[PDB]
Design an enzyme around this catalytic site. Structure first.
Site, PDB file in Angstrom:
ATOM      1  N   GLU A 148       0.968  11.807 -11.379  1.00 52.82           N
ATOM      2  CA  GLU A 148       1.054  11.949 -12.803  1.00 52.82           C
ATOM      3  C   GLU A 148       0.133  10.900 -13.417  1.00 52.82           C
ATOM      4  OE1 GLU A 148       5.843  12.919 -12.830  1.00 52.82           O
ATOM      5  OE2 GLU A 148       5.262  11.121 -13.956  1.00 52.82           O
ATOM      6  N   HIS A 185       0.862  -1.160   0.000  1.00 53.26           N
ATOM      7  CA  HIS A 185       0.000   0.000   0.000  1.00 53.26           C
ATOM      8  C   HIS A 185       0.907   1.221   0.000  1.00 53.26           C
ATOM      9  CE1 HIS A 185       0.957  -0.240   4.488  1.00 53.26           C
ATOM     10  NE2 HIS A 185       0.910   1.065   4.386  1.00 53.26           N
ATOM     11  N   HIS A 244       7.323  11.245  -6.511  1.00 53.33           N
ATOM     12  CA  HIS A 244       6.004  11.311  -7.160  1.00 53.33           C
ATOM     13  C   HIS A 244       5.417   9.943  -7.412  1.00 53.33           C
ATOM     14  CE1 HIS A 244       8.063  11.438 -11.392  1.00 53.33           C
ATOM     15  NE2 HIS A 244       7.283  10.358 -11.439  1.00 53.33           N
TER      16      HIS A 244
END
Lengths: 118, 125
Positions: free
Chosen positions: A99, A9, A60
């Site tokens: 993204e 996770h 990211h």
């Protein structure tokens, strides 16, 4: 033999759980599974995300979308006042960098000459 | 109209050779590509990009119960920075918490999402 099996996770700290639940469940269409004192769990893109309420540029998380969906996502993020920075780059309400891409990372690998491929 | 899957995660790191040793040698990922300030790996089915640049987040991977002691010993044997978890997380083979050379917090867990859900059974949707 001996490999990590899979991702389990991700966990993100957030300033305001209600703002983050509308972002992950409504704007990104994830599934809300549970909430607690200062926590929410989602399933999004097959991934368990845990958000922890506690009222940046060095990481990211990128997600894959159907290329025929690219205009749908760009318009959805735009029409919901998301911070936007074929590929879409954006943040959640706390600034976590996200993204969307319409090709796998491996397909980019195939794109790239002075790099070293293994 | 749903996001399909994770594409990759990216981390900034101070020293690419130290991070290659951590993600590839210690965690047994595969090095796939490098460039001047960049390296890409496959780890646990996940693509990880590192960008060399001279908490609010953690990432957790699943391991089998039968490999918990192997992993805990491997991290200790490599002087990885191990962080405390809940009481009995080690003895009951539940979780290991640690960081990479740059401080990015990571976790190994033997339990899944359904196990966590069952276990908590808070407001359940």
């Amino acid at each position: 033999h001996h490999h990590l099996k899979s991702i389990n996770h991700i966990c993100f700290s957030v300033r305001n759980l209600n703002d983050s639940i509308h972002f992950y469940r409504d704007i990104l269409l994830g599934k809300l599974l549970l909430t607690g004192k200062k926590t929410a769990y989602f399933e999004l893109a097959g991934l368990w995300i845990a958000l922890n309420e506690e009222k940046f540029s060095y990481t990211h998380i990128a997600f894959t979308i159907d290329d025929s969906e690219f205009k749908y996502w760009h318009q959805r993020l735009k029409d919901n006042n998301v911070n936007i920075l074929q590929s879409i780059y954006f943040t959640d309400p706390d600034g976590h960098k996200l993204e969307l891409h319409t090709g796998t990372l491996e397909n980019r690998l195939n794109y790239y000459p002075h790099m070293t491929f293994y």
